[PDB]
Amino acid sequence: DQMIVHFSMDGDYIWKESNEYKTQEEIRDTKKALIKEAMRKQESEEPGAN
Amino acid sequence: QAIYLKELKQSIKDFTNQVSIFRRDYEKNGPMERLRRF
Incomplete structure (x- = not known):
C-alpha cells in the first residue's frame, strides 16, 4: 500500500436513518421481544408476579 | 425446558408453600430442653 497514517481512529458514531442504524434497531427489538415474552x-x- | 417451564410455574408455587412450611418448622424448633429443641 505504501501509504503512512500518523493517527488512525475508529469510532461508534452513526447518523440518523443509516443502514447500520436499522440493523442496530433490529438487534434492540429482538432482545426486547425476548425480554417482553419472558x-x-x-x-x-405466576399470580400477581412482581 | 418448554414442558419444564409449565412444570416450573407449578413448582414455584409448590416451593413458596414449602418455604413457608420450613420457616414455620424453624420457628417451632426455636421455641430449657424446649428452648434448645425450638
Missing part, C-alpha cells in the same frame, strides 16, 4: 410469560404463569 416478562409476560413469567407474569402470566
Whole structure:
C-alpha cells in the first residue's frame, strides 16, 4: 500500500436513518421481544408476579 | 425446558408453600430442653 497514517481512529458514531442504524434497531427489538415474552410469560404463569 | 417451564410455574408455587412450611418448622424448633429443641 505504501501509504503512512500518523493517527488512525475508529469510532461508534452513526447518523440518523443509516443502514447500520436499522440493523442496530433490529438487534434492540429482538432482545426486547425476548425480554417482553419472558416478562409476560413469567407474569402470566405466576399470580400477581412482581 | 418448554414442558419444564409449565412444570416450573407449578413448582414455584409448590416451593413458596414449602418455604413457608420450613420457616414455620424453624420457628417451632426455636421455641430449657424446649428452648434448645425450638
